[PDB]
Design an enzyme around this catalytic site. Structure first.
Site, mmCIF file in Angstrom:
data_model
loop_
_atom_site.group_PDB
_atom_site.id
_atom_site.type_symbol
_atom_site.label_atom_id
_atom_site.label_comp_id
_atom_site.label_asym_id
_atom_site.label_seq_id
_atom_site.Cartn_x
_atom_site.Cartn_y
_atom_site.Cartn_z
ATOM 1 N N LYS A 62 0.833 -1.202 0.000
ATOM 2 C CA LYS A 62 0.000 0.000 0.000
ATOM 3 C C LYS A 62 0.880 1.270 0.000
ATOM 4 C CE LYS A 62 -0.467 -0.201 4.980
ATOM 5 N NZ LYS A 62 -1.250 -0.649 6.153
ATOM 6 N N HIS B 48 -9.567 19.484 4.473
ATOM 7 C CA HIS B 48 -9.856 18.129 4.993
ATOM 8 C C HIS B 48 -11.000 17.406 4.249
ATOM 9 C CE1 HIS B 48 -12.859 20.307 7.384
ATOM 10 N NE2 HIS B 48 -13.445 19.144 7.605
ATOM 11 N N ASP C 6 -8.711 1.164 -0.601
ATOM 12 C CA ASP C 6 -8.584 1.641 0.775
ATOM 13 C C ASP C 6 -9.995 1.768 1.387
ATOM 14 O OD1 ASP C 6 -7.566 2.700 3.193
ATOM 15 O OD2 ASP C 6 -6.307 4.200 2.221
#
Length: 312
Positions: free
Chosen positions: A155, A168, A239
């Site tokens: 990963k 964010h 993910d």
């Protein structure tokens, strides 16, 4: 195959509430034929308890069970001591412990490169600051797992090392050129492909590859690059779909269907039962019209479990 059509649950990896497999959770895994689970701190108390939990999961889920865990010194430490054989042996010991409790999948190595000193996104968890060092210790980590019968998963493809987030709620971006990507982010994955049975993708937008979609939702990246250019035939897993930037930009079910279509074999559908159910429901509509494609995805998952059986 006529007798064994692909079910939507066979394309998801879910999380579990606690250290014990309660009856409702067992009924739920069995009901949907869920074939993959990832364990976290909330599921781990002791080796005895964990062994009991994984044995139970193997009994409920059957021979194709993928029982993964997310996570002993740091990768930076090993990278710095720079003894390839040490790195392999530490991973071999970790894999032996996992194998003894009935886990057959570990989410390492990190092949992200900590390239930018003024931007340590990954930091401790990378083996180094250049592709060469990450490649050498990544190889050792893969081999230590593989030789002990645990599937490792590299990963986060195509490389989380040097990403920039506008806020964010925005997807992180990498704006480097292709040639830069080839020499950096992409190099360790490319070098380590024949030794990598599974790859986890990153929710990151690479301008030079696909300026419109994060890697996890990008047919250009998952199919164009990984499958076609590189010839990769291992497992591609997304993910966690519960991460904020994705969650703010897409619906859960839509995102999971798009990942599978783009080229993922396996979607991490983490969170409470209701969000897992919503993901199942979306994949349930996709699966009937895409049977040959999803058969291929399931067989990759099944080939992995045959090679690395869970049963302790």
């Amino acid at each position: 195959s006529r007798l064994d059509p692909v079910r939507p649950g066979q394309l998801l990896m879910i999380d579990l509430p606690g250290p014990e497999l309660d009856k409702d959770t067992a009924a739920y895994l069995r009901e949907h034929g869920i074939g993959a689970v990832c364990l976290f701190g909330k599921n781990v108390e002791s080796a005895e308890q964990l062994r009991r939990l994984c044995a139970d999961l193997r009994e409920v889920m059957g021979e194709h069970a993928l029982i993964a865990i997310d996570h002993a010194p740091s990768a930076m430490s090993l990278g710095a001591a720079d003894d390839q054989q040490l790195t392999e042996d530490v991973n071999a010991a970790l894999a032996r412990q996992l194998r003894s409790v009935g886990i057959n999948w570990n989410f390492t190595p990190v092949l992200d490169i900590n390239v930018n000193p003024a931007n340590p996104v990954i930091g401790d968890r990378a083996y180094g600051s250049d592709a060469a060092r990450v490649t050498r210790h990544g190889r050792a980590a893969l081999a230590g797992h593989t030789r002990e019968g645990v599937a490792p998963c590299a990963k986060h493809f195509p490389g989380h090392g040097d990403t920039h987030q506008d806020s964010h709620l925005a997807l992180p971006r990498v704006s480097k050129s292709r040639a830069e990507l080839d020499a950096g982010e992409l190099a360790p994955f490319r070098a380590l492909l024949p030794e990598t049975p599974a790859i986890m993708t990153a929710h990151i937008v690479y301008d030079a590859l696909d300026a419109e979609h994060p890697a996890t939702l990008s047919p250009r990246i998952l199919t164009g690059l990984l499958r076609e250019e590189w010839g990769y035939d291992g497992v591609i897993v997304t993910d966690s779909m519960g991460m904020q930037a994705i969650d703010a930009n897409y619906g859960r079910g839509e995102a999971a269907v798009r990942a599978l279509r783009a080229g993922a074999d396996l979607v991490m559908a983490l969170g409470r039962r209701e969000v897992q159910q919503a993901t199942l429901a979306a994949v349930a509509e996709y699966v009937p019209e895409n049977q040959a494609a999803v058969a291929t995805k399931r067989e990759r998952l099944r080939a992995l479990a045959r090679r690395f059986p869970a049963q302790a």
